[PDB]
Design a protein around this ligand. Structure first.
Ligand SMILES: O=c1c2ncn3c2ncn1[C@@H]1O[C@H](COP(=O)(O)OP(=O)(O)OC[C@H]2O[C@@H]3[C@H](O)[C@@H]2O)[C@@H](O)[C@H]1O
Lengths: 251, 251
């Protein structure tokens, strides 16, 4: 895979942009300066083989980069990236990891270490499946763990309820591995939103299948639980992109 | 008004982020590097009184920063920032000026010149309703002119049809003054979208009032014209944010 060009410059540019201008009324500023964050980030992977990573590698980076998250507004998602982000609305209705500083800085970027100077590969990175799971997941898994550990109040989790191939909730998804296990007792409720894409056969429903497994796990952690399928506000978002869908017929 | 802190760092950080990572499959990269663009931007206003600007001040900057724009995808808007950008969807449905390099770099920012070193004011800028019209409109007017000049094919214009104080279309808006008059013969059609805010009185409608004045002007330029009020794609986005509104009732 081809890595992001001028990694340090893009990291530092996003970092400065975010610091001064992004999410000002939504998320707090971090204490560390961008240059300090860059040092922590770079030390996690640099001068190592590109697969030489584990869930602890970026611990210091996430420590420095982690913001306090607004109560009741934290959102998680599995399988529905675009809908979840669209609904969250860039921080206005919910927060996603991509609205947080480390999320915003590294969103969509590709990088990897190497042993020789300059300690990272500017030409080429291994396909992600060639490394061990703990290396593949080192960055975004720690990102997701640190974010989950910071959540307070009600959290929302949006899942795909129309994928015949992947359960709406899986123990081995990022939410199952790094999200739910890391929710602290500051969390009070998990609110699940089941997305049924328009025109697709409904596969999973609240109170059944993997969603019932999830309900039981959430209750066992002493969180309250609720679950809704295509609630109106979400249905309207889907309809905006497919207004002639049967489900979108206006009175 | 309070000027943006670290103006140069934010401009350069946004410029570099944009260059390497933003709109890659939507808009072309420009030839000029970010330091060259900064030089052109800064010289437009630096070492002058804060109102000592006119439409030519940022000529070099905008000439350097201008991108070829995607045919049929250019959108203009007046009075409807959030709705226009939500609908345009970060370049996926339409481009807005704020998705172009210069619009992205300076969106939301506040700056102004002073004669004394360092040539710009870090403490306070004029409300600019204080500067003469050519100065107040120097930056965003030239931005609009240059963007309109580059537009090709069908262009879309979203307006507020629910504002009792400000007509949907007026000749002195940025679009009326700098947009429409600068559309070239590469433009084939102006498609107007009139926002009727949910729960609010309708003030303007297609085929009447200022929208009829606009229709006349568009036809006089030998462009085709159409106009729709709350087309369903836009209505459903409004509804997502106010799902109990009467307009949103489903069959
Ligand atoms: O399994 C996921 C995953 N599920 C959910 N997420 C994942 N990120 C990475 N991974 C894996 O690590 C490797 C690397 O991901 P990436 O390309 O950098 O993230 P990407 O750009 O595909 O996705 C980044 C992203 O999507 C969330 C993550 O927390 C975050 O917000 C991928 O191939 C994925 O398999």
């Amino acid at each position: 895979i081809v890595p992001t060009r001028e990694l340090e410059n893009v990291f530092l540019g996003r970092c400065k942009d975010y610091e001064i201008t992004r999410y000002l009324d939504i998320l707090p500023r971090v204490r560390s300066d961008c240059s300090a964050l860059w040092k922590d980030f770079f030390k996690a992977f640099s001068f190592k083989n590109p697969c030489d990573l584990d869930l602890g590698s970026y611990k210091d980076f996430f420590t420095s980069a982690q913001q306090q998250l607004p109560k009741n507004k934290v959102m998680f998602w599995s399988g529905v990236y675009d809908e979840a982000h669209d609904y969250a609305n860039t921080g206005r209705k919910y927060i996603t990891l991509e609205d947080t500083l480390p999320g915003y800085m590294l969103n969509s970027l590709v990088w990897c270490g190497q042993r020789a100077n300059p300690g990272f590969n500017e030409k080429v990175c291994p396909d992600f499946k060639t490394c061990p799971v703990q290396a593949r997941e080192s960055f975004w898994g720690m990102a997701s763990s640190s974010y989950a550990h910071s959540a307070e109040g009600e959290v929302t989790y949006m899942v795909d309820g129309s994928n015949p191939k992947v359960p709406a909730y899986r123990p081995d998804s990022f939410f199952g591995k790094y999200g739910l296990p890391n929710l602290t007792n500051k969390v009070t409720r998990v609110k699940v939103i089941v997305l049924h894409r328009l025109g697709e056969k409904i596969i999973e429903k609240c109170g059944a299948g993997s969603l019932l497994d999830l309900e039981k796990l959430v209750k066992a952690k002493h969180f309250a639980f609720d679950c809704v399928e295509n609630p109106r506000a979400v249905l309207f978002l889907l309809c905006s992109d497919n207004p002639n869908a049967r489900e979108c017929r206006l009175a």
